[PDB]
Amino acid sequence: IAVYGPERMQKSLRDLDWFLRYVNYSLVAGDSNMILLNCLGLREILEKACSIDATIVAVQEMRRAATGYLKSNDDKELVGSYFDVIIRSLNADKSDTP
Amino acid sequence: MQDAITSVINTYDVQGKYFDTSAFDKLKAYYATGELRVRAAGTISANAATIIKEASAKLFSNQPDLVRPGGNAYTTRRYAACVRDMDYFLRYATYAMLAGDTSILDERVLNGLKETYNSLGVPISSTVQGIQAMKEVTGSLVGSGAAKEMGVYFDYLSSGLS
Amino acid sequence: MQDAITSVINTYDVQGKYFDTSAFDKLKAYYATGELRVRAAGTISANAATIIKEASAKLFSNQPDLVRPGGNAYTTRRYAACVRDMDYFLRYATYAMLAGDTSILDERVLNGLKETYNSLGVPISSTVQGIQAMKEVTGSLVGSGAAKEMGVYFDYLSSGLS
Amino acid sequence: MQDAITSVINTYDVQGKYFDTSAFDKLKAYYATGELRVRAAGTISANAATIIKEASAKLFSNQPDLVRPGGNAYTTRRYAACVRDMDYFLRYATYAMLAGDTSILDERVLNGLKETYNSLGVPISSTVQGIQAMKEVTGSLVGSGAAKEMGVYFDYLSSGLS
Amino acid sequence: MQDAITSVINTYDVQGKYFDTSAFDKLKAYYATGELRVRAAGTISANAATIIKEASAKLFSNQPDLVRPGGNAYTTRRYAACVRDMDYFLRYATYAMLAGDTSILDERVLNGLKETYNSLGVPISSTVQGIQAMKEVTGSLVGSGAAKEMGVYFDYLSSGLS
Amino acid sequence: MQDAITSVINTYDVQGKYFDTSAFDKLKAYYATGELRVRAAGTISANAATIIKEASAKLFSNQPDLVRPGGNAYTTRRYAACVRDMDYFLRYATYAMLAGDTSILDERVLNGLKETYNSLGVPISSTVQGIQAMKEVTGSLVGSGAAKEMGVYFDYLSSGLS
Amino acid sequence: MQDAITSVINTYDVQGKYFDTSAFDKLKAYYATGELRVRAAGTISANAATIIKEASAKLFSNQPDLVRPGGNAYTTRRYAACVRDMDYFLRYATYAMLAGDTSILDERVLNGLKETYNSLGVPISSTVQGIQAMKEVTGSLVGSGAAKEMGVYFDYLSSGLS
Amino acid sequence: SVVTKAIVSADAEARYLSPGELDRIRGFVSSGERRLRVAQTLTESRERIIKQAGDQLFQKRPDLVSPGGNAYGAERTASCLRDLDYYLRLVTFGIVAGDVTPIEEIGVIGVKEMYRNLEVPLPGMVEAVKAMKSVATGLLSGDDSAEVGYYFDYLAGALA
Amino acid sequence: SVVTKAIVSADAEARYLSPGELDRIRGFVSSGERRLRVAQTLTESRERIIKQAGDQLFQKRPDLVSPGGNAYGAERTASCLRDLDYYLRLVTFGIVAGDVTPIEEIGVIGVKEMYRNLEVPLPGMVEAVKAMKSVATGLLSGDDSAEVGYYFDYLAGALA
Amino acid sequence: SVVTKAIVSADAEARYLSPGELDRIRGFVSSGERRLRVAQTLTESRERIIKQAGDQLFQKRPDLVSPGGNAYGAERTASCLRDLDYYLRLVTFGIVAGDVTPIEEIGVIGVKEMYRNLEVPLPGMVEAVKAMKSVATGLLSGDDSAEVGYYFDYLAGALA
Amino acid sequence: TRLFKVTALIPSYKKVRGGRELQNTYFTKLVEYDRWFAEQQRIQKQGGKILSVKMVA
């Protein structure tokens, strides 16, 4: 926490909250399109001042935590897909943005 | 366009916070009428031509001057255009009912409607009367519960015209 | 201008026709709504400064670029112009609501407003947002029944600008 | 668009005159600066993505509400659109510097931009701040004289938006 | 468009009436003048380039400023545009004379033309003077009655540009 | 109307930023040229009538048809209006030079001037020639540097008309 | 569609190898012939109309039946088509001259022309004779060195259409 | 009309009328008086034509006035005769105009949609048009009957 | 201009100028002094060039100034020479601009229609511009003669 | 190349080459020998550029050769070096042609899709090309170094 | 001289297209005589190859 400083910590926390908020929104809308499109361009923005591997670990951890509370196989698979879209997009942006 | 879901999502995204009790209440109210609205939409989509027939019959019986010479609906072309406009109004009211938002109406009917009818000389009050007749017919056809949901958007269109 | 009573009178005068059952039905409808209209008009007259107060504050909170330097509402002159326009919008919506007709809105406000705003550089999206602000601010003060009535005139203003 | 040579040609053609001593002096002045302009343009094309990065970073640091919920840069979509607008401004300012005239700026950027942002809701003042940030970023990379020349066109863009 | 026969047909159709003695008299008048109209149209079509030549020569001799540098007709492109406008005026005057009605003149020339010249900077007074020149040149070739008939439509164009 | 100082003030108020070194530099440059501007303005004011006299003499010698019958300056009335217009151009060019900004020309001189002259029938090209003759006369009286300064405003007027 | 330089680039790129010294010698050859090629191109651009004049004249002189009725040039439309074909052949021959390669001829002239003429029935022999007529005169104007160098492109066109 | 069609056709290619369509206009104009006389005959005899056409239609197609028919009832029969009157007037307009353009614009564009909304059998309209054509051509001489018959034929084909 | 063409070609592709376009601009600005000298020589000699070229044109084609010719008369001859002055000014504009764009956009677009309206024989105009080529290239050095002659040949081909 | 672009531009509007196009072709051919000398120098020492650029890139971005990186492994490093060799050859081709059309046509159009298929980080392209540019500009003289570095600059911008 | 039946293949050299564009590349149309010169020129400028043309009427 100390190395980044208050600004990057605030950005990181609001970004994790952002991910989970968009997961909720997409579950409401019936489509993970908003998460998808908002993640087609995220890695190039993050890379210089952020760790992509750290973000992937964070999204996987949130996936595990969210799947824990659901206690229903269909619910678990749906939320797992709506997080796997985030992991998939950050993985797809290994080269430049599309 | 927008629906109720998009409106709530944007309202809470601009604030940057999750759904509160009022949000979940709005979504539950929107979802509760969903099957009724889809049934009404199926009825209208299936029987649009019929609704046009009774709506036009009522409108032109109440105002025979429209279809007599010197009236705005006096020709085969202008009568066809009148009933075509009525079909437009019915279809876009159905779209708005299914969406739960009047954004589609403002975007794709009201934007340029007044310019069109004032350029062409179409009587706006008579168009409002035709929309009201369509409301009555479609309410009689789809049941009172769906009649109210149709009527809110029919009134939105009527107030947009007048 | 024109109200509901005068609208019916003019329709029957151009037809050279007599007041039939439909005309008296419309007249009865207006007389039934009259007391609600008058109560709403008095309430809005009482709280007009408050309505402009709150609507301006909310519009500039949702879109703070307007009041910061470089915004269309950034100066004392341009801010006062915004407040003056909103005060017109409230007063003329109240006139239209009390009359039961939007002809006054058309002729006194909407005939030439788009071109004025486009020549001035005034944002029209933000003006529609301010009108919606006044709409849902006055809706709380007048009550749900009177809000449903004043809302159609606020939406008429918004659709005329949009 | 027109460059310095075309500007002088137009000024002398509308008067029906051949080039006098002043015309040749001005043309020679433009020709003397051509190599500097080409070198500056190559340097800017070298670091265009860089300049965009520092300019956007400085803008969003000094304007943090842009990327917070309710800000117009709060999205990856809206962020990409903003940085593409920044790309537009840098590219066309480089075109203007290379041409030696501000005509291309007015023709292809400034004309209709304020109304475009008013429709979209884009803050003009924040865009002016981004253009200025781009100016300080570009000046250091291009050097003193190239910075004066190149910042003339950035100032033209800012004043046109202002 | 609309011609004399279509004009009478439309006037009687809006009323819903059959043709009577006055309408038949108007139709007979048009049928009487048809042969003269056809001769005049053929003569004009044979000599259109000539008429444009003398009319342009007259206009640019009496107003040589138009074709010197700084004038509206000063370039090969703008001179060609001027003579093309005169050619279109002549052709549509011929069309109106053949039809016997000025409806085509309105629809295909005069709707939006004054705004176009106001934007372009075209001197409408000089255009009208050129139209009058075409009128007098055409009259000599076409003869007395054909000259009166053609002058009706030339004056209609001139007053429409007003 | 805005001068260089006012332009700096506005371009810093739109940003909301206070004055920094660059603004003080531009203001210092304006004060550096202020003495030249004041001397040129005083010289032009001292000899306005003379300048108009040689400029009009040169224009009417180069284009004698203007003051002959059938020319737009053939009347005591129209000749007086012509020299009045020439005085307008000289005085407002002096204003613009003294302000250091071409804003006043667009703001009070060139706005609707083309439409006005085209409605009057005034030759635009000959007015531009009068402006150029006035430029040549003014330059010799004001000296080389002040002539180079006044030339940008005279050329601005000539390009605005043409 | 490729010149000598892009042709050698292609033949070295397909092998995946870098340029050898023989490639550099081939490149020096074209760079040394470039000024002669450009001079011949300018001469041909200046004299293209005259070359078409005399080439059509000689072609119709040697073969009289073509212009006479029953010939594959006997029509005003068909005459224009023939002269257009010869003009296009000359222009593309000059293009191939400047490029130094016949690839442009294949890609923009012989691409579908052979079977087009075959279906239309154009005689191959007359077309080859016309190509020869253009070549042996163009070589006279362009000089012997450029004559031998247009020889390859003209007889390439002849052999391709053969 | 003939003049309108010729002029708009010439306008579509930005050119003056060729001598062929000038002969067009001349031939149309030289035939004006006969067209006016035929319009006289049709207009003066409208009342008899409408009644005779209604009787012929209703005897040939009794189902329309039969119970459950479209024209059943005095008011609906009156509307049918009103439609016949409209189309006779449109025929007169077409005769004077020299083409079917008035018929086209006023009573042909959107007529199928109009009657489909009105639940009107188009075959009934065709039969009515044929009957009124026969009645009208009965009054006119052979040369004029041949001319008006094609206007009626165009109306019948448009309704079909 | 050359800079304008490079800029708009880059703009069409939504990119910055390629090394080829920057090299083109470097070449164009490297020749600025030569172009200025050539344009100043042509401007200094405008009266002499017009006088001599008009003389050559009129002796080569006396029909233009003979009775019944288009240039017959003092005023029409003055207009004839004024046109040549216009085109010489356009040629100087093209020299300084580095391309034939100013000539193209001031005195080449619609030139055939303009001179058709003025009954001006285009072959006469071509002969006039060839005479101007000869007279001007006589004044210039060998290197600049070809450069000026290219614009003159372009203008001749445009008129032809 | 330059003449190819000029011919395409001339044929686009169906005319002979403009005087300006002829001047740009003369400027191209006049500098052809210097372009060929640059080609000499870049082609001869290709190994120095490629290896030094690879070393600089790997030092700047150690994650590329680190396990889990795209360049990790001997074969993948060989593919890295082969890609750098390809881009050096294309840069020499563009130097010869006088335009970046060889570079673009061979390995720029669709480069992003291919490198997305390979997971190649485009910043890796940018840094490798910048190292190549540094070495090439160092081994050349200033007048040549600027012009050559323009091509590397275009390639880096295309990758970025 | 009424109609031409033209089969031609215009490839794509400027970019890679995500949509189908298979029938846009390889196609056969009937082209009017007055339009065949311009159409053939357009196909040639596009870089495409005109495989064969026959005469229809």
Ligand SMILES: CCC1=C(C)/C(=C/C2=NC(=C\c3[nH]c(/C=C4\NC(=O)[C@H](C)[C@H]4CC)c(C)c3CCC(=O)O)/C(CCC(=O)O)=C2C)NC1=O
């Ligand atoms: C759901 C839709 C969505 C998300 C999540 C999103 C993230 C996002 N975070 C940003 C800032 C930032 N984000 C981060 C890093 C954070 N980022 C996270 O992925 C990590 C958990 C964490 C660090 C480990 C940092 C350091 C910044 C500061 C700007 C910079 O990186 O240079 C930015 C750039 C705008 C700005 O400067 O504020 C975006 C677009 N954008 C979206 O449209």
Ligand SMILES: CCC1=C(C)/C(=C/C2=NC(=C\c3[nH]c(/C=C4\NC(=O)[C@H](C)[C@H]4CC)c(C)c3CCC(=O)O)/C(CCC(=O)O)=C2C)NC1=O
């Ligand atoms: C969904 C968006 C939409 C709307 C709203 C719409 C309205 C519309 N109605 C039109 C015609 C018309 N519309 C009417 C309307 C009737 N007149 C009668 O009196 C009644 C009062 C009234 C209906 C109850 C008439 C008579 C015309 C023909 C007028 C003419 O062309 O002269 C036209 C002109 C274009 C055309 O004729 O095809 C438009 C644009 N079009 C759209 O794409």
Ligand SMILES: CCC1=C(C)/C(=C/C2=NC(=C\c3[nH]c(/C=C4\NC(=O)[C@H](C)[C@H]4CC)c(C)c3CCC(=O)O)/C(CCC(=O)O)=C2C)NC1=O
């Ligand atoms: C450059 C010209 C200019 C000025 C000056 C200006 C003043 C200004 N003052 C405001 C509010 C305010 N202004 C004040 C200041 C007052 N409080 C005390 O009573 C004092 C007597 C007094 C200060 C000495 C306060 C407290 C508010 C907040 C009121 C509110 O938020 O409702 C706002 C609204 C801010 C927004 O909507 O986001 C503006 C625009 N605006 C301009 O464009």
Ligand SMILES: CCC1=C(C)/C(=C/C2=NC(=C\c3[nH]c(/C=C4\NC(=O)[C@H](C)[C@H]4CC)c(C)c3CCC(=O)O)/C(CCC(=O)O)=C2C)NC1=O
């Ligand atoms: C129809 C109305 C009308 C009038 C009256 C008129 C007068 C007039 N006289 C002029 C010249 C002149 N006018 C005079 C006459 C003066 N010489 C003596 O002092 C006398 C006091 C007096 C005559 C009795 C002279 C000497 C000039 C020559 C001025 C010069 O060239 O310097 C000019 C300048 C243009 C030209 O020379 O053609 C005008 C406009 N113009 C008009 O359109």
Ligand SMILES: CCC1=C(C)/C(=C/C2=NC(=C\c3[nH]c(/C=C4\NC(=O)[C@H](C)[C@H]4CC)c(C)c3CCC(=O)O)/C(CCC(=O)O)=C2C)NC1=O
């Ligand atoms: C840029 C490459 C290219 C060229 C040149 C070309 C020419 C060409 N010539 C055509 C017909 C023609 N071509 C010719 C010319 C030939 N007949 C004789 O006169 C001569 C021996 C010979 C000229 C050397 C003629 C006369 C016609 C019209 C004959 C007809 O109507 O069938 C056509 C058919 C379409 C049309 O004419 O509108 C084309 C496309 N097409 C191309 O893609």
Ligand SMILES: CCC1=C(C)/C(=C/C2=NC(=C\c3[nH]c(/C=C4\NC(=O)[C@H](C)[C@H]4CC)c(C)c3CCC(=O)O)/C(CCC(=O)O)=C2C)NC1=O
């Ligand atoms: C000038 C162009 C024009 C036409 C043609 C036209 C026809 C027309 N016929 C109508 C009614 C009618 N039309 C008919 C005629 C049918 N009955 C039989 O089945 C026959 C097949 C057929 C007649 C031959 C009938 C029975 C009605 C009454 C139906 C109703 O009450 O809706 C109506 C509805 C208005 C009214 O009832 O007064 C129209 C608009 N209107 C026009 O503006």
Ligand SMILES: CCC1=C(C)/C(=C/C2=NC(=C\c3[nH]c(/C=C4\NC(=O)[C@H](C)[C@H]4CC)c(C)c3CCC(=O)O)/C(CCC(=O)O)=C2C)NC1=O
């Ligand atoms: C800047 C571009 C430009 C050009 C080129 C131009 C040409 C031009 N030439 C004109 C007349 C003329 N031009 C000529 C010249 C021709 N006579 C012989 O045939 C020669 C072959 C040839 C000259 C070498 C002549 C004789 C006239 C007088 C025509 C007449 O009085 O009827 C006119 C009409 C001027 C008037 O009297 O109102 C124009 C506008 N205008 C322009 O704005």
Ligand SMILES: CCC1=C(C)/C(=C/C2=NC(=C\c3[nH]c(/C=C4\NC(=O)[C@H](C)[C@H]4CC)c(C)c3CCC(=O)O)/C(CCC(=O)O)=C2C)NC1=O
């Ligand atoms: C001339 C046009 C052209 C280019 C440019 C081109 C590039 C190219 N590089 C490839 C492999 C590769 N390229 C690289 C190099 C990259 N990865 C590292 O991270 C570095 C950042 C970076 C080098 C600086 C690597 C590591 C591979 C191996 C990837 C694999 O085989 O899975 C491949 C896959 C096929 C093969 O290697 O045979 C292609 C097609 N191909 C072409 O036809």
Ligand SMILES: CCC1=C(C)/C(=C/C2=NC(=C\c3[nH]c(/C=C4\NC(=O)[C@H](C)[C@H]4CC)c(C)c3CCC(=O)O)/C(CCC(=O)O)=C2C)NC1=O
């Ligand atoms: C949806 C149905 C569909 C198909 C199937 C299709 C195939 C197709 N492939 C094309 C080009 C191409 N296709 C390939 C791929 C080939 N080369 C490799 O070695 C492989 C052996 C092989 C593919 C497995 C290549 C290399 C090109 C470019 C060829 C060139 O332009 O020279 C093109 C030309 C248009 C373009 O380049 O964008 C088409 C139409 N297009 C379609 O719309």
